[PDB]
Write a protein that binds this ligand. Structure first.
Ligand SMILES: Cc1c(Cc2ccccc2)nc(C(C)(C)C)c(-c2nnn[nH]2)c1-c1ccccc1
Length: 130
């Protein structure tokens, strides 16, 4: 859709604070905050795949909209994830240990805009086509 492609991180706001809320420790936050990952999004039938590639860490999730799945996050959390399409926005919720975080991926102009919320912390990451 508007989401399919290869997307390179070009900007990030409040990622260190978000990682802190995720319980990521200092040395790991340092490494994560300088990463400039590629995000490759593809769709085949029901199944959407989101691949993250960086020198620090690669991740991949494949999923069906509305169908909860198990995910190991980049920072090694074991979470229950559910992703839906809401007014053109991919909305992801991860739930683990009575906590949750929400990740919204939207297409705005040339950009893929990713908004991550946990507790009072909102991080916004902007990716552009590679
Ligand atoms: C939480 C998180 C972490 C945690 C982490 C920190 C430090 C070391 C290892 C993990 N790391 C990454 C890197 C840079 C490492 C891939 C991401 C990420 N994925 N796509 N773009 N950025 C996210 C992330 C960002 C937005 C949406 C979903 C996940």
């Amino acid at each position: 859709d508007a989401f399919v492609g290869t997307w390179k991180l070009v900007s990030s706001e409040n990622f260190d604070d978000y990682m802190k809320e995720l319980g990521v420790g200092f040395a790991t936050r340092k490494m994560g905050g300088m990463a400039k990952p590629n995000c490759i999004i593809s769709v085949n039938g029901d199944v959407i795949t989101i691949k993250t590639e960086s020198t620090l860490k690669n991740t991949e999730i494949s999923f069906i909209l509305g169908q909860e799945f198990d995910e190991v996050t980049a920072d090694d959390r074991k979470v229950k994830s559910t992703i839906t399409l809401d007014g053109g926005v991919l909305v992801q919720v991860q739930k683990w240990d009575g906590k949750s975080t929400t990740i919204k991926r939207k297409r705005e102009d040339d950009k893929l805009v990713v908004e991550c919320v946990m507790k009072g912390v909102t991080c916004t990451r902007v990716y552009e086509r590679a």
